[PDB]
From Swiss-Prot, chain A:
First and last residue of the signal peptide: none
Gene that this polypeptide is encoded by: PLS3
The name this protein goes by in its record: Plastin-3
Location of the protein in the cell: Cytoplasm
Modified residues (Phosphothreonine): 4
UniProt function note: Actin-bundling protein.
Covered range of the whole protein: 388 to 504 of 630
Curated annotation (Swiss-Prot), chains B, C, D:
Sites of Methionine (R)-sulfoxide modification: 40, 43
Residues found modified as N6-methyllysine: 80
Purpose: Actins are highly conserved proteins that are involved in various types of cell motility and are ubiquitously expressed in all eukaryotic cells.
Cellular component GO terms, alphabetical: actin cytoskeleton; actin filament; stress fiber; striated muscle thin filament
Disulfide bond positions: none
Protein name: Actin, alpha skeletal muscle
PTM field: Oxidation of Met-40 and Met-43 by MICALs (MICAL1, MICAL2 or MICAL3) to form methionine sulfoxide promotes actin filament depolymerization. MICAL1 and MICAL2 produce the (R)-S-oxide form. The (R)-S-oxide form is reverted by MSRB1 and MSRB2, which promotes actin repolymerization. Monomethylation at Lys-80 (K84me1) regulates actin-myosin interaction and actomyosin-dependent processes. Demethylation by ALKBH4 is required for maintaining actomyosin dynamics supporting normal cleavage furrow ingression during cytokinesis and cell migration.
Assigned protein family: Belongs to the actin family.
Subcellular location: Cytoplasm, Cytoskeleton
Record note on quaternary structure: Polymerization of globular actin (G-actin) leads to a structural filament (F-actin) in the form of a two-stranded helix. Each actin can bind to 4 others.
Catalysed transformations (reactions): ATP + H2O = ADP + phosphate + H(+)
The organism's taxonomic lineage, starting at the top: Eukaryota, Metazoa, Chordata, Craniata, Vertebrata
Organism listed in the record: Gallus gallus
Gene name of the encoded protein: ACTA1
PANTHER family referenced in this protein's UniProt entry, alphabetically: ACTIN
PTM-bearing positions, type Tele-methylhistidine: 69
Length: 117, 370, 370, 370
């Protein structure tokens, strides 16, 4: 199992990464703000906190070279929508573009709450 | 249960945990909404911008301050702002952390009651307390006797304290602070051809404040120097690459504090305000109040403010005993530091407004418990 | 089933299916009719020529560009062109394919209304949507912020976009494009003794322009190079065997883009138009607008156009910050690529103008939905 | 001798003599230069067109407005305009007649200093003075208490005055006037297929706006009337014989005054600006300020502007107090009438900025004397 200290990383982000790695995410999350931009890992974490996910609305990791950014933004928007209504999260001012652009504050605000559930 | 110390001011929001020496979250208290039209799909899902996202995308957003002159105008917005503070910035559950919030003196009671009701019925904390910003600023300085001039974004007030005893009859409140200074700066920038109207440009004007404005020790001498020479001219670069230069408005804006008539106000200067506050106190305690002048707030960050305070008060002094001005480098977070110190005290643990007291006394319990 | 993406331009028509990376059908937007007398029986049964058959038989036909400056002049002609595109080029029945078409900004509303009414009432499609060519250009580049310089055969326009939010007040349209450049080359070709009057010869001169014309980085020294030397001379062979030579008209023709006064036009160059469009936006978004300049269309195919564009903007820049312009090689089909991307999006399927919406709201539903 | 009262506005120049009831010279403030090639000898001796000769020959001239939003940008053009209005329009020597000009509030000081230097050095008039347009508007109405909302061609500003005392802190300037309305009308005219892009066509668009636009009492009811019935359509004939018809753009153009978001501006409507200005004043004088709402300028010539103004203030009024609108028929020349009245006063003869005051104090004497 990977137990290493990065050059720049708080203990909170290390706990986040270790939690998602130990929970069995399909990719290997090495950076929080560089691997969650596609919102696929967030969707994978969603069913493990008993939040149903409709995979027919999810774009697969194979992305066409045209409109891939639009597909990733759609995935982030769907993840936010799934977290809001049926999941009852407190995410004020957080949108799909924030997760797509890797906003650290709003991404940490979502992951720590995911471990809360 | 680590107590929360959230000092939400008119301009900035200061939040953190009791025991820390510095707030963990310092973001402007703004709510941003788009004013343009989005053409592509998948991006217009966000309706409001609360934290620094409003500051970053301010070009396509309109900025509104939910707190005006230490008085709430838009109660819907603090729900968003407080949820942001609790979940995005601090990332803690309010239901487990009792939160200490601050309030300016001579604030209408409905504000405090509605704020207590909102925070209890939405965030469901175990307990609460409301402390005055000036008292916390004295807690940060480790004093029990003195007069604190708290000048933040909307409220400038003086609170004299002697041996831990306050004098409400000697406490006043001046609604002249950094926001009015920014308004004056925008008004006077049109003299050089620099026009700023949109709310986004107000942030640039506040940046010009914080990078170019200073308090003149002698106003007429600085006018003479600016009119005769050109050494006071300073250049500022706009975000789009344009460069503006100001040499006189640097000290004209902060002088509105000493000369409220600059924005057409009949009030006197802050030095005169604190002198009158001390005159409202006992003659036996005026000696200690002159020797303890503690500053706080972002408005006290102009260069030369402390020397001008000393000069003006000594001019108003009986000319026999010395004047002491205290301007710690942590003035902007003195209220938060004092709140953290107070919430960390074991004696203060019995002063919290527990939820069972609220459930039986309504929002009015804060009036008797604070 | 699948969405049709057809870019009905003034000169060329780009058509295909959603999800494709390039339009399937690209033929000139012309309508050809005979202008001679048939003497042998068996060839006069064809009344009009729509696709490439008009171009191939142009020696005995008159060529009409029905779409002029992105404005519809002859509705029966685009009826024929759309029937051709749907049945002979794409060979798909419109009644089961929702079709996404493109439209230039600052286009009269009657155009969009009549086009919506016609294509629902003639082609009986289930749904429609109308996208902007500049928006689809940014879709092709995969960008959400920047100003688009789309210059096709009829319309050159700029649309500033920051975080996807467009500024209608900063959007302006210029009616100078490749057709006007071909006409100016026609006007300046008579200096060397080359005369072309027939609309068939218009396509020949357009072909000459698409091959020998280029944008000069510096125009006045190119004047000296062409007048003093012969290295800029280039030869083109006419279809009937004759060969013409142009050395100065190669780069004088594209200069009308930056010098509209060549044709007696009072408007400014494309660089100045882009500069004014950026300056009409918010100061905070101007940095990103400069940092993202997208050009598109077949008119942007002249060699050296991007270098001249960046040099002119840098001269117009505040000289402190950086300028770069995106010049992809799919510029001629960027609008179609963006249309395919948009129509392929799952979330875009809800904004198709359903035929039941049309049947109850008239042709005016297209204004509310687009 | 006789003082000269010249109102150098953004769009029109009003000139005459002190004491007169109407200006003697009213010509557009434009400078025209040829934009074509002269091929017949003996006609190209004229290079600049200042007065109505620029308006009459605009088909071959480029029209430039020297004044932009009441701010001076081209100094040679206004020197030509002043020479014209002094020697051909009024045909009087400036060196003998003191000249009284007007100036908008929140105008950069360099403008006033340079203009003062110009008319002490180019025309070297014996005396001069600079007064605010709003003050002259109150002088024309014969009032000493009230708020003045002046809207000309470049500047719209509110100036409240109580018993002859002005309140600078309640004065703000909005850069939205007839020129911006003409630009908006041109922008919305392309919806009907009417395109006018040259500077000569700008005057035609302005003429159409003047003779066909009106202020809607209720904007949404007018939307419904225009979209339902055709009684709002009106016809205008172009100089070449073409006739255009507009039914909805008539009242969409003036609505931008109350809805600046039409042109993408974050500012509020003129009614809200006046409400804020009155609220920025003392509550004791607000009673007289509301009952004295004096407007002036060519922008106040739209039909129904007074009724909409009254309705908006009444909606913004405390609902218990009376509002009065003053819209004299001489609003377009109210500034000039007030200037003539002031310069005809015997008491005003001592505030003239004499030549000797300038010769000792530089151009800065105007700031002290005005
Ligand atoms: N370096 C500075 N110089 C001058 N003024 C400042 C500076 N920093 C902040 N301010 C002013 O103080 C305000 C914030 O002060 P603060 O103590 O945060 O007020 P509040 O607690 O009411 O939000 C800012 O909005 C600005 O107007
Ligand atoms: N390599 C080239 N050099 C110069 N001009 C070109 C080149 N390729 C295309 N063009 C011009 O661009 C035009 C194509 O514009 P287009 O994008 O098809 O307009 P629309 O989008 O309205 O159909 C043609 O008329 C042609 O004159
Ligand atoms: N009857 C009218 N209806 C609508 N607009 C008008 C009318 N008359 C004049 N205007 C507009 O008012 C403007 C006149 O501005 P003006 O008051 O002359 O400015 P200044 O006072 O700065 O010279 C013109 O630009 C014109 O477009
Ligand atoms: Mg504070
Ligand atoms: Mg095109
Ligand atoms: Mg005027």
């Amino acid at each position: 199992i990977d137990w290493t200290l990065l050059e720049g990383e708080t203990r909170e982000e290390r706990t986040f990464r270790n939690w998602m790695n130990s929970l069995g995410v399909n990719p290997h999350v090495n950076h929080l703000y560089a691997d969650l931009q596609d919102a696929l890992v967030i969707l994978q974490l969603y069913e493990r906190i008993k939040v149903p996910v409709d995979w027919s609305k999810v774009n697969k990791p194979p992305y066409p070279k045209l409109g891939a950014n639009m597909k990733k933004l759609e995935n982030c928007n769907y993840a936010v929508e799934l977290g809001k209504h049926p999941a009852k999260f407190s995410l004020v001012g957080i949108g799909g573009q924030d997760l797509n652009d890797g906003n650290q504050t709003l991404t940490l605000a979502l992951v720590w709450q995911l471990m809360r559930r | 249960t680590t107590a929360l110390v959230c000092d939400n001011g008119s301009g900035l929001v200061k939040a953190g945990f009791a025991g820390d020496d510095a707030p963990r979250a310092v973001f402007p208290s703004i709510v941003g909404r788009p004013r343009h039209q989005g053409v592509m799909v998948g991006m217009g899902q966000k309706d409001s911008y609360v934290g620094d996202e409003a500051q970053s995308k301010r070009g396509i957003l309109t900025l509104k301050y939910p707190i005006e002159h230490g008085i709430i105008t838009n109660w819907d917005d603090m729900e968003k702002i407080w949820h942001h503070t609790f979940y995005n910035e601090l990332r803690v559950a309010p239901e487990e952390h009792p939160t200490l919030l601050t309030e300016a003196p001579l604030n209408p009671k409905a504000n405090r009651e509605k704020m207590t009701q909102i925070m209890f019925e939405t965030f469901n904390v175990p307990a609460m307390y409301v402390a005055i910003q000036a008292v916390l600023s004295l807690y940060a300085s480790g004093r029990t006797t003195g007069i604190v001039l708290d000048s933040g974004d909307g409220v400038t007030h003086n609170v004299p304290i002697y041996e831990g005893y306050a004098l409400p009859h000697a406490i006043m409140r001046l609604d002249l602070a950094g926001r009015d200074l920014t308004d004056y700066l925008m008004k006077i920038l049109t003299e050089r051809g620099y026009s700023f109207v949109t709310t986004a440009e107000r942030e640039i004007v506040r940046d010009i404040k914080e990078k170019l404005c200073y308090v003149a020790l002698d106003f007429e001498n600085e006018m003479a120097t600016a009119a005769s020479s050109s050494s006071l001219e300073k250049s500022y670069e706009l975000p789009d690459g344009q460069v503006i230069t100001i040499g006189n408005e640097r000290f004209r804006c902060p002088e509105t504090l000493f000369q409220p008539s600059f924005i057409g106000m009949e009030s006197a200067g802050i030095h005169e305000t604190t002198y009158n506050s001390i005159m409202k106190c006992d003659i036996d305690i005026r000696k200690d109040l002159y020797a303890n002048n503690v500053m706080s707030g972002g408005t006290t960050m102009y260069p030369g403010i402390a020397d001008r305070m000393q000069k003006e008060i000594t001019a108003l002094a009986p000319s026999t005993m010395k004047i002491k001005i205290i301007a710690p480098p942590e003035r902007k977070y003195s209220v938060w530091i004092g709140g953290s110190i107070l919430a960390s005290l074991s004696t203060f643990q019995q002063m919290w407004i527990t939820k069972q007291e609220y459930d039986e006394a309504g929002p009015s319990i804060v009036h008797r418990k604070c």
